[PDB]
């Protein structure tokens, strides 16, 4: 997102505003006119692409409504401040720093990193329905699990991996217990 | 394996009557060893189990997205509202003797993945097989029935 | 795909429940937590069947034999 100081009201704010948003979901839920979409968002100067080089010269805020405005239950995590007044750009959503494999991990923030790596690798070899049409196609070593199930704990990003339409595993009632020693 | 990097084989299988069971009659499909958790320091494998247990009851799938405002206490409160113990511990009875377990078991659904590796594809045993033409020493590989 | 019959834990028959479930969701707009209840799935061993289930047999049928 492109943050702009220039405003009728006070401090800096993201250019994207609710109006644009509803103007998008109008498109999504619809399928009125001209189909306001990503290209539009990019032409209107709301969102901008940035490489690693240009990344040198800018300053980024993690969350829009946390870190944009100037100014606590014990459960929530501890955060930094808004003291920087110069934010040029604000991150869309931080989770997007994860690749595809990690995206399937729930709560990866709460895991020690190597367990994220090992999951990134193992998740590649799991069974699960790979394509709807397997029945009509020929290739060596296809594997399909009879009854796939979409996970109860989900990551929002799974919506865009089609992971709820092609689930790789089964929810199973699981107890952590030292039982028979087996 | 789980989504959390937990991977394990099956030790053994039991039937319903031999598994432990909650007072409500649920029996676990699967059991894992507590000693997995502390060493590996994967809490998410726990949190998910809890969050899922709520999603199961309330009928609303949970949001595990990495950086959000969802907090453990928040979940615990939601679960308590459904009448289970708020941390996911649950009283279980032994299968064999039908006696309560002096300890309560952390219990709930979780999502699991079966993996390519399957014992049938692995096990092999060779005595007097074929020899490589060159060195007349046993051939390599299971499919070729090597040693 | 296609509605696991019975249930992976308790063994209660979950198969027939599926149709009436979709009926309730489409017709009465009721949320799942209500639907499963009215269907009579008390334990959550059952509930995860219906709720978590992903039905691919539909997307299989659309190929011509």
């Amino acid at each position: 997102f492109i943050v702009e100081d220039d405003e009728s009201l006070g401090h800096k704010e993201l250019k994207v505003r609710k109006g644009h948003i509803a103007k998008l979901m109008a498109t999504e839920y619809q399928d009125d006119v001209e189909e306001y979409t990503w290209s539009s968002l990019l032409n209107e100067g709301l969102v901008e692409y940035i490489d690693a080089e240009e990344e040198e010269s800018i300053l980024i805020a993690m969350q829009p409504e946390d870190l944009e405005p100037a100014e606590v239950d014990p459960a929530k995590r501890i955060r930094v401040s808004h003291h920087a007044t110069t934010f040029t750009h604000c991150e869309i959503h931080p989770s997007m720093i994860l690749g595809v494999a990690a995206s399937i991990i729930p709560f990866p923030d709460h895991n020690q990193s190597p367990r994220n790596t090992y999951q990134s690798a193992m998740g590649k070899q799991a069974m699960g329905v790979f394509l709807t049409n397997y029945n009509v196609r020929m290739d060596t070593m296809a594997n399909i699990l009879y009854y796939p199930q979409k996970p109860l704990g989900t990551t929002r990003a799974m919506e865009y991996l089609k992971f709820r339409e092609l689930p790789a595993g089964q929810n199973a009632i699981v107890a952590i217990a030292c039982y028979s020693g087996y | 394996a789980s989504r959390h990097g937990q991977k394990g084989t099956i030790g053994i299988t039991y039937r319903r009557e031999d598994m432990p069971f909650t007072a409500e009659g649920i029996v676990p499909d699967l059991i894992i060893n507590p000693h997995a958790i502390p060493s590996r320091m994967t809490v998410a494998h726990l949190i998910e189990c809890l969050l899922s247990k709520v999603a199961a009851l309330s009928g609303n799938e949970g949001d595990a997205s990495p950086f959000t405002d969802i907090t453990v206490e928040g979940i615990s409160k939601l679960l308590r509202e459904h009448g289970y113990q708020s941390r996911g511990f649950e009283v279980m009875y032994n299968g064999h003797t039908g006696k309560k377990l002096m300890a309560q078991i952390f219990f709930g659904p979780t999502y699991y993945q079966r993996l390519r590796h399957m014992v049938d594809d692995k096990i092999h045993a060779r005595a007097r097989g074929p020899m490589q033409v060159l060195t007349r020493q046993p051939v390599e590989g299971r499919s070729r029935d090597g040693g | 795909m296609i509605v696991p019959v019975r249930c992976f834990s308790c063994g209660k028959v979950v198969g027939d429940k599926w149709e009436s479930y979709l009926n309730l969701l489409q017709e009465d707009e009721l949320d799942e937590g209500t639907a499963l209840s009215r269907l009579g799935l008390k334990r959550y061993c059952c509930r995860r069947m219906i709720l978590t289930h992903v039905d691919l047999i539909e997307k299989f049928l659309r190929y011509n034999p």
Partner: peptide, 15 residues
């Protein structure tokens, strides 16, 4: 706590 998909019902009842 969970993921809200009832946004079809919400966006239809608001628009």
């Amino acid at each position: 706590f969970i993921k809200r998909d009832r946004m079809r019902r919400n966006f239809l009842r608001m628009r």
